[PDB]
Symmetry: C3
């Protein structure tokens, strides 16, 4: 009755089989991910070659947060130091605005203070909880799966696993789409 | 001249050896644990079959916290995930109300943000520092050893060992009493 | 053209070669360390036999913090437990006043709640960030390299590393001087 990661995964696979445009698979998927995670705003963020990115998919619950769909963000938003952790360690990050702490899990979770710049960035958006897992296409960092919530909350390892399954599945989605649209 | 875990432990073994009533072994021990730890309120909490529990022993320092002796707390107070952590990992938890962080050590200490509900709960009791170690009888989770303090204070890994030795020694006390008092 | 730790290290070694008095090697060096770390106040603190210490070197940026040069601090300022971590574990500590957490790295970083007494001490000085690495002469704990900042700042593993190289290099300076001033 309540969705689980296995079924969300089954549907992404089904959409691959239909040879939907990658942008369509991602849009459809995002809605389900939000329902599964239960957070207020789930987004999928795709990187541009120069390091900047764009929100290409987004599912918000009852307008509890503003919509950033279609918007572009500069590369300075993610420092070299931060990006390196995404590329090399494939790190999942959890920011907790209330405590000013960030916990990172590479692929236990150790929490350390988060840079005040980043927390202000999140606060400006009206976010109190942020979870980010990187999406890849082979060895290429392709984007981010972003989960935002307007209120403070604890994040279990269960939730990190669910997110990892989804970004792992999207990698298959992306890689397959490239192969089918090979000239 | 002063108290160490070793002298406190010997007295428990002596009380086991002399077969004092278990409820007495527990009461006496609780008082010494408070003196050993130096905290304001140390309690021993025994679980009921349905998951709820009762404070069956308590030693407070200079009336600095209210007495909760004899009181029952519902099972909802300790969520499934929390209880699972107690049963499988035999986890020690340290709550720091000031920083909103909780540190857990399975059987180093990793700190993460603690659920706001639990912090509100402790604040309701007037507690700024809480240390909890689980008590077992054989494989069965029997109760908890609880240390509360009205003011903020840091809890060292040394102190967790002391608590761990005591709950290990109390397990022998409880186990032995069942054996001696078999009809 | 720009400053990094190797160039700073190289400069300490150069002063040794010129056989400068140790006090000169230390005074000169601190200014370069501050320039390297970019912090408001970098100090070198030397222990007295009785546990007390003295600020023997100091480099401040644009009078953003008061001068502590020449002042003495009692041994109670560094408790037995804290000093023990310095002696056996040779711990580098980072205190983040905003979150009230302290992160310690022995020779990864784990953050724990810092004692309220110490936070009050740093707040009284107007310090929001403090990074401390111990200096040794053979087995003897000789002093501390201290970095203070008037604002929230994050310390990376890399920066602890630069600092470790520096105290390791100063240790050679000190050890050499003892050898030369042996009767
Ligand atoms: C400070 C002046 C600037 C800055 C620094 C900064 N950013 C990060 C870390 C991250 N920033 C992002 C950016 C985003 N988060 C999102 O949810 C989105 C999409 C809406 C973006 C573009 C991300 C993903 C990170 C990584 C952290 C994480 O995964 O949550 C840091 C590192 C913080 C730390 O302490 O680790 C820093 C220092 N960000 C700015 O906007 C500034 C210009
Ligand atoms: C309360 C009884 C007193 C007290 C306790 C206390 N201090 C520390 C930690 C440290 N205190 C120092 C001392 C200094 N740090 C400095 O930057 C300076 C100025 C040169 C001094 C004199 C140090 C080095 C530490 C170690 C922590 C670190 O390296 O950053 C603690 C331990 C804190 C903890 O939780 O680990 C305690 C309990 N300090 C006082 O001043 C009180 C008299
Ligand atoms: C009097 C003795 C005593 C009790 C009974 C107690 C309850 C208690 N609540 C706990 C956790 C918890 N309790 C709750 C939730 C709740 N708790 C509530 O009372 C709410 C009804 C509810 C929020 C709606 C949660 C979420 C946790 C886990 C906190 C975390 O792990 O972040 C824990 C485990 C955390 C720890 O080990 O410190 C205990 C022992 N603590 C005590 O010292």
């Amino acid at each position: 009755v309540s969705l689980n990661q296995e079924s969300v995964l089954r549907r992404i696979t089904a959409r691959i089989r239909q040879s939907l445009e990658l942008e369509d698979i991602i849009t459809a998927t995002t809605a389900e991910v939000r329902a599964l995670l239960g957070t207020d705003r789930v987004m999928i963020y795709k990187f541009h070659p120069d390091g900047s990115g764009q929100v290409i998919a987004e599912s918000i619950y009852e307008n509890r947060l503003p919509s950033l769909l279609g918007l572009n963000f500069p590369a300075d938003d993610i420092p070299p130091q931060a990006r390196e952790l995404l590329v090399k360690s494939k790190v999942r990050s959890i920011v907790d605005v209330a405590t000013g702490m960030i916990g990172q899990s590479p692929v236990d979770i150790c929490y350390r203070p988060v840079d005040s710049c980043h927390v202000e960035y999140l606060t400006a958006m009206g976010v109190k909880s942020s979870v980010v897992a990187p999406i890849f296409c082979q060895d290429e960092l392709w984007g981010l799966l972003v989960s935002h919530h307007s209120e403070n909350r604890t994040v279990s390892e269960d939730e990190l696993e669910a997110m990892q399954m989804i970004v792992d599945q999207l990698a298959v989605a992306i890689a397959q789409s490239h192969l089918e649209h090979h000239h």
